[PDB]
Amino acid sequence: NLWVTVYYGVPVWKEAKTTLFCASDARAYEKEVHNVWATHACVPTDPSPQELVLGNVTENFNMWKNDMVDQMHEDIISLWDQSLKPCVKLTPLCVTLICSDATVKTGTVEEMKNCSFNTTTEIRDKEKKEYALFYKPDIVPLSETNNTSEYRLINCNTSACTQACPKVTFEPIPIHYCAPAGYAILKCNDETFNGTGPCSNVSTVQCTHGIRPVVSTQLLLNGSLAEKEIVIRSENLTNNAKIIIVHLHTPVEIVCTRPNNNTRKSVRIGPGQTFYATGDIIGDIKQAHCNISEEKWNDTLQKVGIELQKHFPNKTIKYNQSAGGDMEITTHSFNCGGEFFYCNTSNLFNGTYNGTYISTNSSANSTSTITLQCRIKQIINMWQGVGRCMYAPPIAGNITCRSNITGLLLTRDGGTNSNETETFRPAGGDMRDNWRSELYKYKVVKIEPLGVAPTRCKRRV
């Protein structure tokens, strides 16, 4: 009686994994092909994006199980390796150093150490005595030292480093991802959507929006803002191992600078290869620091305490310092202009909030700015050493950089005496947690355009 029919082009899909590809914003890259993220090679997104809302569509989402974040983590690591591959190596530089104090007095910062060493010229048999300035975190006193001037680099007992090429620009150019044809990207539109759940408002798109590959820890910088409400995302909310992602509704403007006039010198190493170093400091040395508007930060912390105490009732929240550990883990680390910053952040996370709105003084007018000191490393082993270590070349002149804090990485210090006063600390280290805040919305699916239905419709014969 009834007859099967099959239809081509039906609108059904399925969950799948696939290899995405990059797409820039058709920016004028003809001068800037030397970007470290190699974004010039991507296909330019010419037209308007396919902002196609579906309607009557509900689907479950899980951004903690998303494949996309791991793929783009691998892509960032591979980009770093392929950008750092043809640059100059620093194997001959790992020699015995003789070091003294270049800064006159200990002051408030003196960590610019002077050192001298030997190098190989263009000729193999000609050794040349040379000198350079370094930072105290970069250099390590030599083994079995009699409190001497004998010094070495930090990396030399771990792995060799390569310096970054001077043409390389570390500006975070925005990157779009597009699924291949035959696949699709579904994104959420629900305004209060946390990490998991059914999204009532789902729209398809061919390519994602312009997310940015910002290298930072403990503070999300220049991310996409929360649209109307501060979002708290955590995989369990009761396990301390699950890192809380805090998505702020309003940005907090932060300024960071190195004030002193640094100078750059060059040293010939080997046949046709050069090395760049800090030669001298011009003028009076001053402390590298960052500046944050205190009132806005306090009001933001108050609203975060509101959003957390509505998740944790009858418990005061203590904004405390992060747990002790390494320099790269405790300090807020980032880069701006091509140099790397590590900021102290003790006095930044120093406060508390209970159910009472403690601070109506935010309604009063003030110009209080918290200032926190920062230090500078030349040699880094970030992403836990899975890439080759990069020696950042120094940059002449002063450096200034401005940013928006849009998100926080927090952990719950679940102590035994936290029956009423809960402790939340800065956290970080896993760089994909920076990116899960930006890939919370998107999801990849596979189109399956064949359908089966009966209609009692018989083929002619």
Partner: protein, 122 residues
């Protein structure tokens, strides 16, 4: 693209061409750039080959000459084609699906061999 995904099958019977309209158009990055095109070509050619085997290729609606089995049948025609949507219907029609393609293939082969046995003398 997918402009009527939540609608009924009768409503999607007008917009079934816009899905197939966009199925083929759109050194670290270069590897993925190659891979996406290879995957898209394979994905299109798969079900194009399947429609070619079933013989109803070149048209979006297939008349099959295969009887619908009663074990597959639970709903009425008006219950399906006016009330039901494609995406949730795919969940319940996921059962028994694997033999339908072979049934269509053998019916198409039987039709072709009967047409040959007719037209060899006719």
């Amino acid at each position: 693209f997918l402009g009527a995904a939540g609608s009924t099958m009768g409503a999607a019977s007008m917009t079934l061409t816009v899905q197939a309209r966009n199925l083929l158009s759109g050194t670290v990055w270069g590897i993925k750039q190659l891979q996406a095109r290879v995957l898209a070509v394979e994905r299109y050619l798969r079900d194009q080959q399947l429609l070619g085997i079933w013989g109803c290729s070149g048209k979006l609606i297939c008349c099959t000459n295969v009887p619908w089995n009663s074990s597959w049948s639970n709903r009425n025609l008006s219950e399906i084609w006016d009330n039901m949507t494609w995406l949730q219907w795919d969940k319940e029609i996921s059962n028994y699906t694997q033999i339908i393609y072979g049934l269509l293939e053998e019916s198409q082969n039987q039709q072709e061999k009967n047409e040959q046995d007719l037209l060899a003398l006719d």
